[PDB]
Amino acid sequence: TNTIFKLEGVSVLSPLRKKLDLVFYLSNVDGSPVITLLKGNDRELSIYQLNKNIKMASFLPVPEKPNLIYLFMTYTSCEDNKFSEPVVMTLNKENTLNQFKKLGLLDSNVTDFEKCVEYIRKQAILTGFKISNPFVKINSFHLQCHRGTKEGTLYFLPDHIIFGFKKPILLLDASDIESITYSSITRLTFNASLVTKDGEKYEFSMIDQTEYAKIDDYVKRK
Numbered sequence: 001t002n003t004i005f006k007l008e009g010v011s012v013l014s015p016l017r018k019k020l021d022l023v024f025y026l027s028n029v030d031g032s033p034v035i036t037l038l039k040g041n042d043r044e045l046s047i048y049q050l051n052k053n054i055k056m057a058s059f060l061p062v063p064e065k066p067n068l069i070y071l072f073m074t075y076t077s078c079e080d081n082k083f084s085e086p087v088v089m090t091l092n093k094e095n096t097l098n099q100f101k102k103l104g105l106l107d108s109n110v111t112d113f114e115k116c117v118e119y120i121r122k123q124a125i126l127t128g129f130k131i132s133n134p135f136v137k138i139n140s141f142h143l144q145c146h147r148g149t150k151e152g153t154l155y156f157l158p159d160h161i162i163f164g165f166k167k168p169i170l171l172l173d174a175s176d177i178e179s180i181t182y183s184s185i186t187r188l189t190f191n192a193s194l195v196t197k198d199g200e201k202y203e204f205s206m207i208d209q210t211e212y213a214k215i216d217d218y219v220k221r222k
């Protein structure tokens with residue numbers, strides 16, 4: 001098969017939590033792209049025909065850790081139906097640059113990790129899918145809140161809201177939101193409940209008061 005690039009020792013958080021090698025390659029059979037996560041020569045996870053089976057993929061910031069970045073993907077199905085939770089991995093920026101240099105993909109004097117992100121995004125497009133990068137012209141933002149007892153990060157992206165990354169990770173299409181309701185309103189915090197077109201209600205609690213304006217604006221976006 002035709003291997004395009006590989007990254008070793010990537011920290012995968014979902015749908016399993018292991019350090020794994022990432023291989024991106026093109027199928028022998030029809031040229032469609034494949035990603036597999038390897039431990040030795042064992043395939044722990046594989047997703048075929050990424051041009052058909054990736055529903056959404058994005059690079060996302062890691063709160064308070066500018067030296068790292070998440071690569072997040074949702075998929076329709078995977079090899080042997082092993083998993084359903086989204087792929088989330090953590091890349092160390094400097095590590096990634098160094099591996100790209102060793103593979104000959106970037107010159108040794110390149111210092112900007114955004115060159116790695118550009119290469120990976122172009123590779124997706126050449127193979128027929130898209131990886132977004134909303135935090136590098138619509139303004140995306142993220143904040144910490146709770147779903148019940150579990151803390152997590154709520155990312156507001158141009159067409160999606162994501163709450164992560166404890167199981168089960170939540171992705172909502174922005175165009176599916178019908179309304180927002182605020183409750184438990186206090187000086188420092190409030191709760192917001194997003195109701196979707198299908199009538200489902202998603203409640204996020206203990207959101208900082210400073211986030212109200214951006215969230216209220218986001219839901220009213222025309």
Ligand SMILES: CC(=O)NCCc1c[nH]cn1
Nearest residue numbers: 009010011090091092096
């Ligand atoms: C070790 C870590 O925190 N994240 C995955 C490390 C990495 C970055 N690039 C390749 N591997």
Ligand SMILES: CC(=O)NCCc1c[nH]cn1
Nearest residue numbers: 158159174218219221222
């Ligand atoms: C809720 C939201 O972010 N957007 C509604 C419409 C839209 C599409 N792209 C940007 N805005």
